[PDB]
Design a protein around this ligand. Structure first.
Ligand SMILES: OC[C@H]1O[C@@](CO)(O[C@H]2O[C@H](CO)[C@@H](O)[C@H](O)[C@H]2O)[C@@H](O)[C@@H]1O
Ligand SMILES: OC[C@H]1O[C@@](CO)(O[C@H]2O[C@H](CO)[C@@H](O)[C@H](O)[C@H]2O)[C@@H](O)[C@@H]1O
Ligand SMILES: [Ca+2]
Ligand SMILES: [Ca+2]
Ligand SMILES: [Mn+2]
Ligand SMILES: [Mn+2]
Lengths: 47, 181, 181, 47
């Protein structure tokens, strides 16, 4: 099993609006590949 | 308190709780953002707006998302451009394609973007990508030039498990990608 | 598999994950469907479409909802018309007001309505309510004339806790209302 | 503590579409009352 981790301080409050939409994006250009998502789970608690 | 929570282990041909943009679509139980074809963009957003911070109390949400994805390239030498998990305004539409990953339009910091993206970048764009030229995971904030990156070795056609967590107490976003092999 | 969960213990003035129809609005941390005023209708829908059954597998979802509501009438003699929790097609708009509760337009079974509602009926409509003339909880399917009812003694201005659960293995819908006192 | 329960078999599959929206409704007519909701939680599981 191989894994990679990364962390950074991101002051969300100063960057994004109070309400947002979350999602996935993938693109290709002069080179390319297929990008697929097989499952997705999410959780948030405010307050 | 407001909590939102969802889990999808198999996508339906008609996922009404998802908004598809560009070439995104579901097939065979999966969500396909792009096929292996040139110059294309695919995006899929969960339909419900998420309450991420509250202006009255000043509180910010804690959240965690996990997903499995696969990149299937023709060979380890023809691979681009990458994939992102992102958080943007409710009215978000696809931005520039190619190395901009469908989420940003410039490497300069643009405060009107209001987008935070975690990228899994498979192609070296000399104008802004890290100089070692390796594939990498990066945290992007209002620009395609990451604030922090981590080299990553792509395993072509392998299923990656990713977990992304934001701790509101600390303002730390953490990302972890894992291959079974 | 697909699951969805949410919990709102205090409504925001700008509650973007709800769709408001008629007179419904959020105020002082709560959701106001109607004020004590004549001939009005208020409805609020969670914005996300919910996958209740799957035509591919024939699976049907198990679900539970829990809420706290208050009916505050001028006296125990001037009280109408009632409140419902309902499940309807995604494109649902307010139906007939008054004793129809904003969800149905007839006492005759109408399969094109495709609406199931749990009513908390506080006014006796002779054309269809139970003959004992008492206030009642009822299960409505495509018609304002309940398939089953249970007398209920309204406690004016008291908070009621309701739990509604559907067991897909049994096809049984259960409703329980509780007052502290 | 006063409570009331009611059960009925409702074959949802034959009545509602595969995708639905859930919500609250309240009305008044010649007579009236204020109807308000204080909190709401929901959990659904398909498959
Ligand atoms: O083949 C890479 C080569 O093409 C250019 C444009 O001539 O970049 C295109 O393709 C890249 C990989 O798919 C994209 O990142 C880029 O956005 C797109 O313009 C050259 O920049 C690149 O060297
Ligand atoms: O006062 C009740 C009396 O009014 C009528 C109208 O003539 O019904 C109106 O008010 C009722 C309670 O608010 C609603 O259920 C009804 O839908 C509305 O038409 C008479 O039917 C009723 O007895
Ligand atoms: Ca790149
Ligand atoms: Ca009635
Ligand atoms: Mn990059
Ligand atoms: Mn009734």
């Amino acid at each position: 099993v191989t894994s990679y981790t990364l962390n950074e301080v991101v002051p969300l409050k100063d960057v994004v609006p109070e309400w947002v939409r979350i999602g996935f994006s993938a693109t290709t250009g002069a080179e390319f590949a297929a990008h697929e998502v097989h499952s997705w789970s999410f959780h948030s608690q405010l307050g | 308190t407001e909590t939102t929570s969802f889990s999808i282990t198999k996508f339906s041909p008609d996922q009404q709780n998802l908004i598809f943009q560009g070439d995104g679509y579901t097939t065979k139980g999966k969500l396909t953002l792009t096929k292996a074809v040139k110059s294309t963009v695919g995006r899929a957003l969960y339909s419900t707006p998420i309450h991420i911070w509250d202006r009255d109390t000043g509180n910010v949400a804690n959240f965690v998302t996990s997903f499995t994805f696969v990149i299937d390239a023709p060979s380890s030498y023809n691979v681009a451009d990458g994939f992102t998990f992102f958080i943007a305004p409710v009215d978000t539409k696809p931005q520039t394609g190619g190395g901009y990953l469908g989420v940003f339009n410039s490497k300069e910091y643009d405060k009107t973007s209001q987008t935070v993206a975690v990228e899994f970048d498979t192609f070296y764009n000399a104008a802004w990508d890290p100089s070692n030229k390796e594939r990498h995971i990066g945290i992007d904030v209002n620009s395609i030039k990451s604030v922090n990156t981590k080299s990553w070795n792509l395993q072509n056609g392998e299923r990656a498990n990713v977990v992304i967590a934001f701790n509101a107490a600390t303002n730390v976003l953490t990302v972890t990608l894992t291959y079974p092999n």
